[PDB]
Amino acid sequence: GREPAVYFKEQFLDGDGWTSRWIESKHKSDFGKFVLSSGKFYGDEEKDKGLQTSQDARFYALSASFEPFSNKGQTLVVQFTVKHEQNIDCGGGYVKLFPNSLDQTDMHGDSEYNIMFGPDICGPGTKKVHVIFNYKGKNVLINKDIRCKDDEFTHLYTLIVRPDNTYEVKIDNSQVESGSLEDDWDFSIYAYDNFGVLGLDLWQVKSGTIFDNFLITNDEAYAEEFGNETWGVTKAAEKQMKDKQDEEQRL
Ligand SMILES: [Ca+2]
Numbered sequence: 001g002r003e004p005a006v007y008f009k010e011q012f013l014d015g016d017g018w019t020s021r022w023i024e025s026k027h028k029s030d031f032g033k034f035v036l037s038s039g040k041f042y043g044d045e046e047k048d049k050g051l052q053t054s055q056d057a058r059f060y061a062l063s064a065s066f067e068p069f070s071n072k073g074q075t076l077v078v079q080f081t082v083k084h085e086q087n088i089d090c091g092g093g094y095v096k097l098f099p100n101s102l103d104q105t106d107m108h109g110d111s112e113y114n115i116m117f118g119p120d121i122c123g124p125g126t127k128k129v130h131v132i133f134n135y136k137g138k139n140v141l142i143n144k145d146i147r148c149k150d151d152e153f154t155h156l157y158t159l160i161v162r163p164d165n166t167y168e169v170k171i172d173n174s175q176v177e178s179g180s181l182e183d184d185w186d187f188s189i190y191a192y193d194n195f196g197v198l199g200l201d202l203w204q205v206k207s208g209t210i211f212d213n214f215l216i217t218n219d220e221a222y223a224e225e226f227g228n229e230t231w232g233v234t235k236a237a238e239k240q241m242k243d244k245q246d247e248e249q250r251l
Helices: 015-020 220-250
Strands: 006-010 022-024 034-037 050-053 058-069 076-083 090-092 095-098 115-122 127-135 138-141 154-161 166-171 174-180 195-204 210-217
Touching: 006 058, 015 034, 050 058, 050 195, 076 095, 076 115, 076 220, 115 154, 127 166, 154 210, 154 220, 166 220, 195 210, 210 220
Parallel strands: none
Antiparallel strands: 006 210, 022 058, 034 050, 050 210, 058 195, 076 154, 076 210, 090 115, 090 195, 095 115, 095 195, 115 127, 127 138, 154 166, 166 174
């Protein structure tokens, strides 16, 4: 049978239909709720709908399952958009890729995972992109400092992992970091037997972040193409709308 290039895609285009694809963890009874919204300003009111954190000072735990796969002998790409529309003080904006053994109804901050990737902000001192590989019972952190975006607009985050043990990180479809797994972490290191769930495990103080346009693919050129069709289409119209609102607030 024909092998797919896309393992997972989520754009939230079918209204409340997303609730059949994403599971809320019940690990705690006080997790915050994600709501479907395109927010105060956006590129397109319908296309720019995504998952938005709705409660301040709260832990979040929501995840989506997909047909399990292995990245052995292939490239792996994880990509999504993050929009901290609230002008965030402190909060996570990263994803985790888990093996199929994860119980989605029990997912939490300390559940075992394979890879963690994305922006984390906590005051001026923490504006970073995490790139964590689980290896031989340790969650190994990248030894390179990658600065994340901190404004109110939609930004595209991309992690590419290749079978030659090389990686690349992109922000807004432009390279920000690259190198070898052997050099940039203190460890087939690239390869995982099973990926089955993508999860949002976050802590936020000022809530309101919107997540959209998730993609997991073995095709790095396609991730760039989809990036331009999503974040690339949102960008200019979103900036025009916020500039217009700031002009209304000014007066
Ligand atoms: Ca969307």
